[PDB]
Amino acid sequence: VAPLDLVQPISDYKIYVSENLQTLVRDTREFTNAVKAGDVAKAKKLFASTRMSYERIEPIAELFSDLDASIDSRADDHEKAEKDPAFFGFHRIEYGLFAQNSAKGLAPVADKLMADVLELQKRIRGLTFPPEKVVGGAAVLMEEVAATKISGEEDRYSHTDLWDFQANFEGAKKIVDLFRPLVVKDNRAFADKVDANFDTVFKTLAKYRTADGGFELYGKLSERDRKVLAGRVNTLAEDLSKMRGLLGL
Ligand SMILES: [Cu+2]
């Protein structure tokens, strides 16, 4: 794959990233202001779907590692866990909303979160996307979805994990789709494989959908169901890992 042939997919991935940030900013506005207005109910129904935008751009969170750890960090990323004042973002607000069932003291965390999403948009505006970090970030995100997220660790309090899994798989697929034209040149069998693998994982999550387009609580998956998904998700990581090889990255 010639270097110049990598320019096209990246710039389209950026438009993609942009549209998700346009959608995130909006949904985070409605979401945060519901939190600050003490409407614990509205904020709970908006939580998972709001994050989908953020969870689809997670294959490149390294390119904004600081805003990542501000927006989407979790309790065990802080030495004082759920009562650490360094804990910010969705999952901090998730604790109050779902676990403790209140909005008390969440107004500060809400505005800071609104700030970070705006700052994330401002960043990516003029941020360049290394192709190996785009493909590589995808493969690893699949690696950690199968290895670590599978535990239910990301949304401890709401158990909205399947929303996030879906958004991760969708964001990762988008990348496979934008690179398929370069890949299919010498590895059509492999491109076809990757599609069928993603298709499998989507068909797997679809068993947990409801008509709204939402998902059952993650607890509802037995530890056997978890291991079956993990195996299917791990296949995705493997492919993205070999896809970046095949493209010369
Ligand atoms: Cu996340």
Side-chain angles (χ1 to χ4, degrees):
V1 166
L4 296 180
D5 275 318
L6 295 181
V7 180
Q8 142 67 24
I10 292 306
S11 307
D12 254 333
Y13 182 67
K14 189 157 176 186
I15 298 167
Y16 183 75
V17 166
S18 307
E19 295 159 353
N20 282 296
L21 289 168
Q22 292 177 335
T23 301
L24 190 63
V25 157
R26 171 193 338 148
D27 286 19
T28 298
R29 183 57 61 89
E30 183 188 15
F31 171 68
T32 48
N33 298 158
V35 171
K36 336 179 59 189
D39 193 338
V40 176
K42 195 173 190 172
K44 284 172 72 177
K45 115 170 146 191
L46 288 181
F47 179 78
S49 65
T50 295
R51 295 170 38 69
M52 302 219 57
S53 321
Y54 181 78
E55 292 295 331
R56 291 193 187 96
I57 72 175
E58 239 174 29
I60 55 163
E62 78 176 62
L63 308 174
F64 47 82
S65 298
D66 61 317
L67 265 61
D68 183 42
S70 190
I71 291 162
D72 201 41
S73 75
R74 296 168 271 282
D76 60 355
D77 292 319
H78 312 261
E79 292 181 301
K80 302 210 175 201
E82 275 80 357
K83 289 182 72 70
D84 202 311
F87 186 20
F88 290 103
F90 289 105
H91 305 301
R92 163 61 187 88
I93 290 171
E94 188 197 15
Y95 175 81
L97 284 181
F98 284 84
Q100 294 303 319
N101 209 266
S102 168
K104 265 35 175 180
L106 289 191
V109 196
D111 195 327
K112 239 210 71 145
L113 173 55
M114 174 60 54
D116 294 352
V117 175
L118 294 180
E119 169 72 7
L120 185 55
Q121 190 169 41
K122 293 185 174 75
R123 286 246 192 124
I124 285 175
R125 297 288 291 178
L127 194 141
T128 189
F129 289 25
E132 73 286 345
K133 288 176 183 60
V134 166
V135 182
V140 182
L141 175 54
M142 297 305 104
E143 183 178 358
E144 59 165 77
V145 154
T148 84
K149 277 194 187 179
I150 188 70
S151 62
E153 67 92 22
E154 173 153 55
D155 306 282
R156 316 162 185 257
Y157 322 119
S158 56
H159 310 113
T160 46
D161 306 81
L162 294 179
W163 270 268
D164 301 356
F165 290 10
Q166 173 73 31
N168 298 151
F169 300 145
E170 285 172 5
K173 185 59 157 59
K174 179 63 175 187
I175 293 167
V176 176
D177 293 26
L178 291 191
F179 271 115
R180 183 174 169 93
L182 303 182
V183 172
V184 173
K185 293 178 177 178
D186 322 323
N187 309 88
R188 183 151 206 282
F190 172 74
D192 290 320
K193 177 212 191 284
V194 176
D195 275 329
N197 282 145
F198 264 95
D199 171 71
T200 286
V201 174
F202 287 124
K203 282 199 179 189
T204 297
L205 244 58
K207 292 170 162 194
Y208 297 97
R209 287 262 200 185
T210 71
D212 55 5
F215 293 96
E216 309 174 1
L217 311 186
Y218 191 57
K220 305 300 187 77
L221 282 81
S222 52
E223 275 62 31
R224 300 289 180 267
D225 289 315
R226 295 178 176 206
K227 251 25 184 180
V228 171
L229 182 60
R232 291 164 188 189
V233 174
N234 185 274
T235 294
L236 298 186
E238 270 162 21
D239 299 320
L240 289 167
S241 208
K242 270 293 131 153
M243 178 170 279
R244 112 182 205 178
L246 265 52
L247 292 166
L249 294 169

